[PDB]
Design a protein around this ligand. Sequence first.
Ligand SMILES: CNCc1ccc(-c2[nH]c3cc(F)cc4c3c2CCNC4=O)cc1
Length: 353
Amino acid sequence: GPESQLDLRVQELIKLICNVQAMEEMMMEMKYNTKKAPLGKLTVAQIKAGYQSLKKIEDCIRAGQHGRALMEACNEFYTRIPHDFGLRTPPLIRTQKELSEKIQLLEALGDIEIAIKLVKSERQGLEHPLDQHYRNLHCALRPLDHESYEFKVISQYLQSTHAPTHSDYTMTLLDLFEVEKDGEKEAFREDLHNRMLLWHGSRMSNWVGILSHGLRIAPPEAPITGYMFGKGIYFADMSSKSANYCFASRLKNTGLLLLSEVALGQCNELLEANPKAEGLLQGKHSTKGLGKMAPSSAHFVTLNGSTVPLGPASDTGILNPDGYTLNYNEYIVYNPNQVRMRYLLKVQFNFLQ
Ligand SMILES: CNCc1ccc(-c2[nH]c3cc(F)cc4c3c2CCNC4=O)cc1
């Protein structure tokens, strides 16, 4: 047929992120019943109806209801968002934690609905299908040389900010791409101080949606208690805190990890979870969940106007007297115009045992 005009490394990335069969397998792993509700029949309306049912579940949880009312709320959720629990009676979502853990399923379904729409796109024999998928992302992806300065600095950031408690794996950088998503530069809050190059990880199934639509905030219908610091976009300064969100496995041990310039401006610093954090900003530009360990000023470098908080991380002196303390920082912005995606890392996860 027509030959691909793409760099082979980009060809490889497209193949990885547009593989729908991998998306089915991953959703099967999350217990979504792809036989009852095939992924090619996912709609936005189904997913929003999903979020609405989770809101009804949140209502029950807030009321302390563990009986028929919660049974029916969960039944409604599981009808709209079919699960496979074997020969068990479907388990109730009884606590805020269980509820919060279910949001990721709806988020993956959202990004898969996007991915399937894109791969099923009309298509013209004029261009190789990889090239057609790439074009449809409206996101430039430029592979960098392993000998480049970029590759050296990012490799150093990846390694030096692998957190000591994320000891289950190491990471190897296999490939690196500069990212330029159409529209992101033009929207970006260049005016804001505290511009940092921060990590964001996600499941393999999500990247067509992320690269084509940008990082997005939860919809209005979603239950607020599902988000530790509210409906924003979350980032780490420690590579492995974000890489944990790739949910790589021993069998699927290749993931993608994103670095983005994040216009934090003035952070509202919090020790503890507060799903209503956004209403606390009062003029501030972002939320910072304070961790016990973080990169220090001493080791920082800049790349294209952004601070790269290279490690090693050291103790921040932070300790919550009145409860739980985050091990590592988290940063949350509540507008996509505080984000510019810059690098996409292809990372191999080297698991223990
Ligand atoms: C569990 N309720 C929904 C939810 C799911 C995931 C996250 C979350 N928190 C993070 C902190 C952080 F430093 C980095 C990341 C995240 C995420 C998911 C997005 N990816 C991150 O790397 C936030 C809320």
